[model samples]
Target: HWGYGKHNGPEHWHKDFPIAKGERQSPVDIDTHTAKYDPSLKPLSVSYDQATSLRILNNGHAFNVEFDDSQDKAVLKGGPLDGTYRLIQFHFHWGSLDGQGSEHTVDKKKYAAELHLVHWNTKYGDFGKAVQQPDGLAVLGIFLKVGSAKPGLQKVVDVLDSIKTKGKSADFTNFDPRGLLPESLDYWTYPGSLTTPPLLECVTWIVLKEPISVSSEQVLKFRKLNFNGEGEPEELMVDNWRPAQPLKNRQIKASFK
Candidate 1:
């Protein structure tokens, strides 16, 4: 069993990993004009602030978080999206050696990386029970293009030293994740399934068409993460991304006026 470094990477992600397949894959590159879909308003307009608290938890396999929506001052108003949806955990997807990372695919095109802003619909109660509801979850997908330096991304990368090793994440207690959101929230809303396992077809996807720019140096920080658990310095998980899948007759709605 080779570690998640170089040639022996994703090839050995284990057979139990049901999410790695050609159908429900991700990292869809969002380049405008290539394809045209009428834009539509997101169910609501969301604002990010420092009060949105997030706790990085130990899931044994990967880092998950428990977000407090009641205390969350950030509000998402208007559109079909009524009530409040809380911001949860944030994670990254990168390349093997030190390039390429995206979760959703578009016509087989991929981006430098992808960041998922997981949110659950308050109308459906807690995220746990909400996960079982049809319109219970709404995950905002933000695409990150590795380019020049992006100071906005520093807050996340700066905490790397704490969670540098796998299964070892530090709590960003005073950190406000709202700063990481893309400047432009104008998005494309659609009905889709979870990009990850269970492939639950119960998600209301609102993917942002606007791209966030991150410096090449910031990209390297994610490239240095480990795969297995804390302790194995050699098990660097460079690219933990999956190939993009087909839209499968799914209608993509844009939110541009």
Candidate 2:
């Protein structure tokens, strides 16, 4: 199976999923000096309904909160995107230790973790069809630094006990995704693929310039969530993140100067 273990890690992903080495792969190192500021880039507009939160699951990769996308109850628009994108789910990537967990780095500097708010273009009939197009998805990247625990993430942390094993899930409702973001929405935009296996080049990445805070204790709780299933041998779920890929021929544009 594709995981972060020594045997089946990111280095070995290209074998099973050839697109893992695609031209527009994701989780690239964000070079602050190299990111060009585009004046035409619009401000990020997000309107999320807390009632849309449905559940949270431990999918053997990362724990993510799924949102009800039957209608346009929540969405992300403007910014580097052309049309409105419906919110699908939001998950995170983290490290085994402090100072190194985030997938996309800032000038090669790693954070404790990274949060991804996954969205799909509304024009596309379904998410399955959307991921097939070049401009299908829009993912917002927010870095997580170790500091005093923020009140926003406490609700998410409180539910970790119910989903301690792989394939485990719980009814996770009434949580607001907007409360977990940094105050500023200034971000760097680029064309990239999914950071996980089946890495399709269909995502337009918008990585925020600022970060949210998480305490070390809170991060440790995530680590306790195992990669193994109920009857399997215990396996720590630490460092479940893909390393930075080559930038290839892509240019990262910024919303601010």
Candidate 3:
């Protein structure tokens, strides 16, 4: 099982997923101090009101939600991206404890959780093919911290019970993906891989500087999910975050001056 467990976690992913050790791997520490301010980078504009939300799934690894991308209903543009990218799915990375869930860290500080909004470039065809290209994906990263109950996040948190077991999925339609974003869109962009296996280095990482809040209890909702499917012995699905890899030669660009 390739998971965040001791025996088969990130440290061991390289055995089966060899690219885990490849250059430009994801979840790199966002060193704001060294990030270059790119005056040329534009502010991102997103529109998802016409988007169709599909289902909420407990995919044995983390919480996930997929979106229908048959049209350009939900798309994000500007900021480091030259072309529009359509939303494919959005998932989360978290840990059992309060201080260590998020994959990306700011100044070496970890957040309670992280939300990923994955999008594929239209020029590269579908997500399956786009993911294989160097300029194929653009994922938005939002850090989740412990704060008072967040009105927008409460909707997803309310549905956690139905998808409590691995492989379980429930209908979660028409919700705005924009609802989960922080009021501000300032971010740090860099080139990196998908944090998970077959970790292709095609993603243009857009990590928001401001964080959205989730109550401590809300953050604990996913802990009810199991790593093993329905019949196997129950194994809590927690700490599904990959540790930050070396920055290597990549340069980070900040959207703000």
Candidate 4:
């Protein structure tokens, strides 16, 4: 299986998945000065039903909180996207070391971590089919800084102990996805990919400029999570973030000046 370790890392992913070398690969550096301010960009609108949150699972790659997208229970609208995009899941990426881990960067500056809220266009039927289309997915990227404790994140971290091993999962609901967002919705927009194997170039990325705070203590707890299941040899799950990709010819748009 693909991992952040030396043998199966991002650099070698193209050997198995050709799309990993695609033009629209994600986790690109956002050069604010070069980004165009789009006056017509719509304000981000989010609707999330806390009850729709189903479970938290350790997929070996990352820990994700899955949602029930059978209906429009939760969706992301406006903000660099056309039509409603249903929320399927949200996950995070971090590093093995302290101070640097986020997948996306701003002007070459890396954050402590990055959170991705994955969504898919409703017009594309299901998420599986949507991944194949050009205008299929919309991912909201939020940067996380190491500072004061994030009270909202405590709820999520509390559950990490139960699902520390790969393949382990547990009931996870009554959590509002909005609690993890920053106060400002101002963002940078571009076309990108899944940032993982298959690396499909189908996501319209909306990366928030404002970052949220998570205490340094909490950040360490995330590293305690393991990539192996209950029986396998222990491996600390960290540095799961992908390095920034080359922008190529894509233009980044800013929703605010």
Residues 35-122 of candidate 4 have per-residue lDDT tens digits of: 9999999999888754288899999989999999999889999998889999999999997766789999999998989999999999
- Candidate-wise lDDT, in order: 0.60, 0.92, 0.90, 0.92
- Ten contiguous residues with the weakest lDDT in model 2: 45-54
Worst 10 residues of 1 by lDDT: 22-31
- Between prediction 2 and prediction 4, which has the larger TM-score? 2
The candidate scoring highest on TM-score is 2
| CA RMSD per model (angstroms) | 4.0, 0.9, 0.9, 1.0
- Evaluate residue 193 in candidate 2 and report its C-alpha lDDT on the 0 to 100 scale: 95
* lDDT score for candidate 2 against the true structure: 0.92
Off by over 4 Å in 3: none
TM-score, cand. 1 vs. native: 0.78
lDDT tens readout by residue for model 3, 17-120: 88888889999999889999999899997877788899999888887898998889899888899998999889988888989999999999999999999999
Question: What is residue 89's positional error in candidate 2, in angstroms?
Answer: 0.5
Which has the better lDDT: candidate 1, or candidate 2? 2
> lDDT: which candidate is best?
2
* Worst lDDT 10-window in candidate 4: 45-54
Per-model TM values vs. the true structure? 0.78, 0.98, 0.98, 0.98
Q: Taking the tens digit of each residue's C-alpha lDDT, what string does model 2 give over 1-257?
A: 89999999999999999999889998999999999999999999988863389999999989989999888888999999999899999999998897889999999999999999999998997899999999999999999999989788989998999999999999998888878889899999999999998999999999999999999988988888888899999998889999999999999999999
Give candidate 1's whole-model lDDT: 0.60
Error of 4 at 65 (Å): 0.4
